[PDB]
PDB file of C-alpha atoms in Angstrom:
ATOM      1  CA  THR E   1      13.922  16.840  19.602  1.00  0.00           C
ATOM      2  CA  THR E   2      12.946  13.206  20.163  1.00  0.00           C
ATOM      3  CA  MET E   3       9.315  14.288  20.539  1.00  0.00           C
ATOM      4  CA  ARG E   4       9.489  16.245  17.268  1.00  0.00           C
ATOM      5  CA  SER E   5      10.890  13.178  15.507  1.00  0.00           C
ATOM      6  CA  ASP E   6       8.050  11.127  16.994  1.00  0.00           C
ATOM      7  CA  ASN E   7       5.552  13.729  15.767  1.00  0.00           C
ATOM      8  CA  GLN E   8       6.962  13.424  12.246  1.00  0.00           C
ATOM      9  CA  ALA E   9       6.650   9.638  12.513  1.00  0.00           C
ATOM     10  CA  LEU E  10       3.004   9.957  13.587  1.00  0.00           C
ATOM     11  CA  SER E  11       2.352  12.307  10.661  1.00  0.00           C
ATOM     12  CA  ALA E  12       3.726   9.660   8.301  1.00  0.00           C
ATOM     13  CA  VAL E  13       1.545   7.104  10.097  1.00  0.00           C
ATOM     14  CA  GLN E  14      -1.469   9.358   9.498  1.00  0.00           C
ATOM     15  CA  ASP E  15      -0.705   9.513   5.778  1.00  0.00           C
ATOM     16  CA  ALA E  16      -0.357   5.721   5.677  1.00  0.00           C
ATOM     17  CA  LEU E  17      -3.640   5.373   7.580  1.00  0.00           C
ATOM     18  CA  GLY E  18      -5.396   7.555   5.022  1.00  0.00           C
ATOM     19  CA  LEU E  19      -3.995   5.476   2.167  1.00  0.00           C
ATOM     20  CA  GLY E  20      -5.080   2.257   3.868  1.00  0.00           C
ATOM     21  CA  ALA E  21      -8.546   3.663   4.527  1.00  0.00           C
ATOM     22  CA  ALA E  22      -8.896   4.509   0.836  1.00  0.00           C
ATOM     23  CA  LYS E  23      -7.812   0.974  -0.086  1.00  0.00           C
ATOM     24  CA  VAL E  24     -10.302  -0.559   2.355  1.00  0.00           C
ATOM     25  CA  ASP E  25     -13.114   1.656   1.057  1.00  0.00           C
ATOM     26  CA  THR E  26     -12.434   0.612  -2.541  1.00  0.00           C
ATOM     27  CA  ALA E  27     -12.264  -3.060  -1.558  1.00  0.00           C
ATOM     28  CA  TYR E  28     -15.519  -2.789   0.400  1.00  0.00           C
ATOM     29  CA  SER E  29     -17.325  -1.115  -2.506  1.00  0.00           C
ATOM     30  CA  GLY E  30     -16.196  -3.869  -4.861  1.00  0.00           C
ATOM     31  CA  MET E  31     -17.181  -6.474  -2.276  1.00  0.00           C
ATOM     32  CA  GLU E  32     -20.695  -5.032  -1.977  1.00  0.00           C
ATOM     33  CA  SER E  33     -21.063  -5.005  -5.762  1.00  0.00           C
ATOM     34  CA  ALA E  34     -20.015  -8.665  -5.903  1.00  0.00           C
ATOM     35  CA  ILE E  35     -22.468  -9.547  -3.121  1.00  0.00           C
ATOM     36  CA  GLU E  36     -25.319  -7.852  -4.986  1.00  0.00           C
ATOM     37  CA  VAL E  37     -24.432  -9.661  -8.220  1.00  0.00           C
ATOM     38  CA  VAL E  38     -24.302 -13.054  -6.494  1.00  0.00           C
ATOM     39  CA  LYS E  39     -27.620 -12.343  -4.764  1.00  0.00           C
ATOM     40  CA  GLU E  40     -29.084 -11.697  -8.215  1.00  0.00           C
ATOM     41  CA  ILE E  41     -27.551 -14.982  -9.411  1.00  0.00           C
ATOM     42  CA  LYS E  42     -29.129 -16.891  -6.525  1.00  0.00           C
ATOM     43  CA  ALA E  43     -32.521 -15.290  -7.173  1.00  0.00           C
ATOM     44  CA  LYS E  44     -32.305 -16.210 -10.858  1.00  0.00           C
ATOM     45  CA  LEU E  45     -31.334 -19.804 -10.079  1.00  0.00           C
ATOM     46  CA  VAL E  46     -34.078 -20.318  -7.487  1.00  0.00           C
ATOM     47  CA  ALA E  47     -36.486 -18.930 -10.076  1.00  0.00           C
ATOM     48  CA  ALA E  48     -35.046 -21.394 -12.613  1.00  0.00           C
ATOM     49  CA  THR E  49     -35.440 -24.442 -10.347  1.00  0.00           C
ATOM     50  CA  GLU E  50     -38.882 -24.856 -11.931  1.00  0.00           C
ATOM     51  CA  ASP E  51     -38.945 -27.402 -14.751  1.00  0.00           C
ATOM     52  CA  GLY E  52     -41.333 -25.266 -16.826  1.00  0.00           C
ATOM     53  CA  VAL E  53     -38.680 -22.607 -17.485  1.00  0.00           C
ATOM     54  CA  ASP E  54     -36.189 -22.986 -20.324  1.00  0.00           C
ATOM     55  CA  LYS E  55     -32.724 -23.182 -18.788  1.00  0.00           C
ATOM     56  CA  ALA E  56     -30.710 -21.743 -21.698  1.00  0.00           C
ATOM     57  CA  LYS E  57     -31.829 -18.190 -20.895  1.00  0.00           C
ATOM     58  CA  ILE E  58     -30.914 -18.646 -17.235  1.00  0.00           C
ATOM     59  CA  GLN E  59     -27.600 -20.196 -18.278  1.00  0.00           C
ATOM     60  CA  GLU E  60     -26.652 -17.188 -20.391  1.00  0.00           C
ATOM     61  CA  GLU E  61     -27.814 -14.825 -17.629  1.00  0.00           C
ATOM     62  CA  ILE E  62     -25.514 -16.545 -15.126  1.00  0.00           C
ATOM     63  CA  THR E  63     -22.742 -16.466 -17.734  1.00  0.00           C
ATOM     64  CA  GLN E  64     -23.121 -12.687 -18.021  1.00  0.00           C
ATOM     65  CA  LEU E  65     -23.264 -12.343 -14.233  1.00  0.00           C
ATOM     66  CA  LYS E  66     -20.111 -14.456 -13.834  1.00  0.00           C
ATOM     67  CA  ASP E  67     -18.324 -12.260 -16.371  1.00  0.00           C
ATOM     68  CA  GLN E  68     -19.476  -9.233 -14.368  1.00  0.00           C
ATOM     69  CA  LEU E  69     -18.165 -10.844 -11.171  1.00  0.00           C
ATOM     70  CA  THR E  70     -14.780 -11.475 -12.785  1.00  0.00           C
ATOM     71  CA  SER E  71     -14.616  -7.891 -14.064  1.00  0.00           C
ATOM     72  CA  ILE E  72     -15.499  -6.521 -10.620  1.00  0.00           C
ATOM     73  CA  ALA E  73     -12.905  -8.748  -8.951  1.00  0.00           C
ATOM     74  CA  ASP E  74     -10.084  -7.778 -11.310  1.00  0.00           C
ATOM     75  CA  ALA E  75     -11.049  -4.088 -11.557  1.00  0.00           C
ATOM     76  CA  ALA E  76     -11.505  -3.205  -7.860  1.00  0.00           C
ATOM     77  CA  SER E  77      -7.848  -2.240  -7.462  1.00  0.00           C
ATOM     78  CA  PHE E  78      -6.788   1.032  -5.860  1.00  0.00           C
ATOM     79  CA  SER E  79      -2.975   1.069  -6.112  1.00  0.00           C
ATOM     80  CA  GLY E  80      -2.225  -2.436  -7.345  1.00  0.00           C
ATOM     81  CA  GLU E  81      -2.868  -3.874  -3.894  1.00  0.00           C
ATOM     82  CA  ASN E  82      -6.541  -4.727  -4.404  1.00  0.00           C
ATOM     83  CA  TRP E  83      -6.937  -7.107  -1.418  1.00  0.00           C
ATOM     84  CA  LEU E  84      -8.785  -9.402  -3.848  1.00  0.00           C
ATOM     85  CA  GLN E  85      -7.842 -12.088  -6.375  1.00  0.00           C
ATOM     86  CA  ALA E  86      -4.724 -12.969  -4.410  1.00  0.00           C
ATOM     87  CA  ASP E  87      -2.293 -15.868  -4.864  1.00  0.00           C
ATOM     88  CA  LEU E  88      -3.303 -18.790  -2.640  1.00  0.00           C
ATOM     89  CA  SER E  89      -0.582 -21.158  -3.873  1.00  0.00           C
ATOM     90  CA  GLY E  90       1.467 -20.300  -0.791  1.00  0.00           C
ATOM     91  CA  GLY E  91      -1.557 -20.964   1.404  1.00  0.00           C
ATOM     92  CA  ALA E  92      -2.170 -17.635   3.132  1.00  0.00           C
ATOM     93  CA  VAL E  93      -1.267 -14.007   2.412  1.00  0.00           C
ATOM     94  CA  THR E  94      -1.648 -11.253   5.010  1.00  0.00           C
ATOM     95  CA  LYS E  95      -2.064  -7.594   4.073  1.00  0.00           C
ATOM     96  CA  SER E  96      -1.080  -4.973   6.640  1.00  0.00           C
ATOM     97  CA  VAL E  97      -2.079  -1.338   7.168  1.00  0.00           C
ATOM     98  CA  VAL E  98       0.203   0.937   9.184  1.00  0.00           C
ATOM     99  CA  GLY E  99      -1.707   1.665  12.375  1.00  0.00           C
TER     100      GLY E  99
ATOM    101  CA  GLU Z   1       3.255   1.037   3.800  1.00  0.00           C
ATOM    102  CA  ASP Z   2       3.286  -1.792   1.271  1.00  0.00           C
ATOM    103  CA  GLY Z   3       1.164   0.124  -1.246  1.00  0.00           C
ATOM    104  CA  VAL Z   4       3.673   2.981  -1.478  1.00  0.00           C
ATOM    105  CA  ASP Z   5       6.291   2.514  -4.186  1.00  0.00           C
ATOM    106  CA  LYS Z   6       9.823   2.299  -2.811  1.00  0.00           C
ATOM    107  CA  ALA Z   7      11.810   3.574  -5.810  1.00  0.00           C
ATOM    108  CA  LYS Z   8      10.811   7.235  -5.450  1.00  0.00           C
ATOM    109  CA  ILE Z   9      11.660   7.084  -1.757  1.00  0.00           C
ATOM    110  CA  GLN Z  10      14.890   5.406  -2.868  1.00  0.00           C
ATOM    111  CA  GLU Z  11      16.138   8.453  -4.746  1.00  0.00           C
ATOM    112  CA  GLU Z  12      14.757  10.622  -1.932  1.00  0.00           C
ATOM    113  CA  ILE Z  13      17.052   8.861   0.550  1.00  0.00           C
ATOM    114  CA  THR Z  14      19.882   8.947  -2.003  1.00  0.00           C
ATOM    115  CA  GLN Z  15      19.579  12.736  -2.250  1.00  0.00           C
ATOM    116  CA  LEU Z  16      19.358  13.001   1.539  1.00  0.00           C
ATOM    117  CA  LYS Z  17      22.509  10.879   1.919  1.00  0.00           C
ATOM    118  CA  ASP Z  18      24.358  13.120  -0.535  1.00  0.00           C
ATOM    119  CA  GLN Z  19      23.122  16.088   1.504  1.00  0.00           C
ATOM    120  CA  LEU Z  20      24.460  14.446   4.671  1.00  0.00           C
ATOM    121  CA  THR Z  21      27.850  13.922   3.024  1.00  0.00           C
ATOM    122  CA  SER Z  22      27.905  17.575   1.950  1.00  0.00           C
ATOM    123  CA  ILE Z  23      27.050  18.641   5.509  1.00  0.00           C
ATOM    124  CA  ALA Z  24      29.808  16.430   6.908  1.00  0.00           C
ATOM    125  CA  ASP Z  25      32.561  17.625   4.573  1.00  0.00           C
ATOM    126  CA  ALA Z  26      31.611  21.300   4.165  1.00  0.00           C
ATOM    127  CA  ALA Z  27      31.271  22.156   7.879  1.00  0.00           C
ATOM    128  CA  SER Z  28      34.848  23.249   8.553  1.00  0.00           C
ATOM    129  CA  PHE Z  29      36.354  26.468   9.894  1.00  0.00           C
ATOM    130  CA  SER Z  30      40.166  26.297   9.638  1.00  0.00           C
ATOM    131  CA  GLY Z  31      40.794  22.683   8.669  1.00  0.00           C
ATOM    132  CA  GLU Z  32      39.766  21.434  12.128  1.00  0.00           C
ATOM    133  CA  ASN Z  33      36.177  20.523  11.277  1.00  0.00           C
ATOM    134  CA  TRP Z  34      35.757  18.292  14.376  1.00  0.00           C
ATOM    135  CA  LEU Z  35      33.967  15.855  12.038  1.00  0.00           C
ATOM    136  CA  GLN Z  36      34.935  13.168   9.516  1.00  0.00           C
ATOM    137  CA  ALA Z  37      37.923  12.313  11.690  1.00  0.00           C
ATOM    138  CA  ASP Z  38      40.229   9.376  10.983  1.00  0.00           C
ATOM    139  CA  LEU Z  39      39.388   6.468  13.301  1.00  0.00           C
ATOM    140  CA  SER Z  40      42.351   4.257  12.386  1.00  0.00           C
ATOM    141  CA  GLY Z  41      43.556   4.494  15.984  1.00  0.00           C
ATOM    142  CA  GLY Z  42      40.009   4.954  17.234  1.00  0.00           C
ATOM    143  CA  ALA Z  43      40.981   7.492  19.915  1.00  0.00           C
ATOM    144  CA  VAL Z  44      41.307  10.823  18.109  1.00  0.00           C
ATOM    145  CA  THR Z  45      41.067  13.741  20.543  1.00  0.00           C
ATOM    146  CA  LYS Z  46      40.845  17.473  19.836  1.00  0.00           C
ATOM    147  CA  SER Z  47      41.468  20.201  22.397  1.00  0.00           C
ATOM    148  CA  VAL Z  48      40.840  23.917  22.894  1.00  0.00           C
ATOM    149  CA  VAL Z  49      43.254  26.132  24.827  1.00  0.00           C
ATOM    150  CA  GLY Z  50      41.310  26.826  28.003  1.00  0.00           C
TER     151      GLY Z  50
END
């Protein structure tokens, strides 16, 4: 009977592990999108370091890319717990996945 | 799990607690249910003619 109860507990742990894996996958996809966008931003800026290039066009490009970054950060949420855009007023927040 | 909402599980456990109460009070044969005894004295004892 104790072993059956333990088996039920491990089944619940498996369900929690699946949920956490889905959350991590969503967070990683959003993270990769943000990395690609910021790489594009860096490429645009290092192109713009030349003085012969008008900087207003680059400025509006980075503005659009920053808006895209904000949208990606606030949208990459699976079940509310998005593991991104947290509250750092306390100093440190730790998310846990049932192992 | 932190991501799982706790309210739905809350009424789940509420229903299970009501089920436990029903199990405790219904399981009787002839008034001597051997459960839900009065522990005012803390030493209630039931016997069967052997």
